[PDB]
Ligand binder design. Structure first.
Ligand SMILES: O=C(O)C(=O)Nc1sc2c(c1C(=O)O)CCNC2
Length: 298
């Protein structure tokens, strides 16, 4: 495997920071004019994280269509993702409006609400079955139907109802609860077990709208998740691990949203996760059971 030789060269020479700096230097810069309009200042969580105009998601709303969210369209892989920031208290209605309008089936949350003593995301889903949430600004009702709590992640089944039309949809919420901000998962096994649970749910299927992926900013942990999933899909289509250039894929994804992957360690972890996941792609389905056991999910 050529990425496995690349990994060893970089690791033994301690070069991860230099490689990551090269990526930052080569990454695309496109206008983000809409994000910076004064009327949108309170729709952005971080001043330095903005969607590009060309790939931003537009709300179907005539007053103000802005949400801090980007469509990542991986044409070669035939998979799309919506990456967004953790919603703010005033944007939780916009968040669910986007989910509705884009026909998403799953939401992947890679952060906790409180991290490092600060609030990184609003509580945007209900905590109890009998206490539904109503978003008066966007006319949606959200109900918790069930939750399956594991040791390091939680899966929730939510019902989203459009109060204008009375039509309902089931949304799956996949919540990774042990991935630190600016950090990496505990092991490739834990990460891959979680990714494959998302895959197996059908949420990434082309018959649904794009999956919504977020962390606090929608770039660091979110980018790591999407990079690994896309690389494994590209390897699967070709059945050729040596045709996937992880750095080129990341640069392609950065055409659609700035800043994807925020540390050299997250880049290094992306390699490890793709190298380990390749074992399943190339025909050893038993590794998936090993990942579940090493993840201590139960
Ligand atoms: O949640 C992530 O993984 C992520 O990218 N977080 C990010 S990226 C980013 C910040 C944060 C943050 O959480 O403080 C602070 C502003 N600079 C960029």
């Amino acid at each position: 495997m050529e990425m496995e030789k690349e990994f060893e060269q970089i690791d033994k020479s301690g070069s991860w920071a230099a490689i990551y700096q090269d990526i930052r230097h080569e990454a695309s810069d496109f206008p983000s004019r809409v994000a910076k309009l004064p009327k949108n200042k309170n729709r952005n969580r971080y001043r330095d994280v903005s969607p590009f105009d060309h790939s931003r998601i537009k709300l179907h709303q005539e007053d103000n269509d802005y949400i801090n969210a980007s469509l990542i369209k991986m044409e070669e892989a035939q998979r799309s993702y919506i990456l967004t920031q953790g919603p703010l208290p005033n944007t939780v209605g916009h968040f669910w409006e986007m989910v509705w309008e884009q026909k998403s089936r799953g939401v992947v949350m890679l952060n906790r609400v409180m991290e490092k003593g600060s609030l990184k995301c609003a509580q945007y889903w209900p905590q109890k079955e009998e206490k539904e949430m109503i978003f008066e600004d966007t006319n949606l009702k959200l109900t918790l139907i069930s939750e399956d709590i594991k040791s390091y992640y939680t899966v929730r089944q939510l019902e989203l109802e459009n109060l204008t039309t009375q039509e309902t949809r089931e949304i799956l919420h996949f919540h990774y609860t042990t991935w630190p901000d600016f950090g990496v998962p505990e092991s490739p096994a834990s990460f891959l077990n979680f990714l494959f649970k998302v895959r197996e749910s059908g949420s990434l299927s082309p018959e649904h709208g794009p999956v919504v992926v977020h962390c606090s900013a929608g770039i660091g942990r979110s980018g790591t998740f999407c990079l690994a999933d896309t690389c494994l899909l590209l390897m699967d289509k070709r059945k050729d691990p040596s045709s996937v250039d992880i750095k080129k894929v990341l640069l392609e994804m950065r055409k659609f949203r700035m800043g994807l992957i925020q540390t050299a360690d997250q880049l290094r972890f992306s390699y490890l996760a793709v190298i380990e996941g390749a074992k399943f792609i190339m025909g050893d389905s038993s590794v998936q059971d090993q990942w579940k056991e090493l993840s201590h999910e139960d």
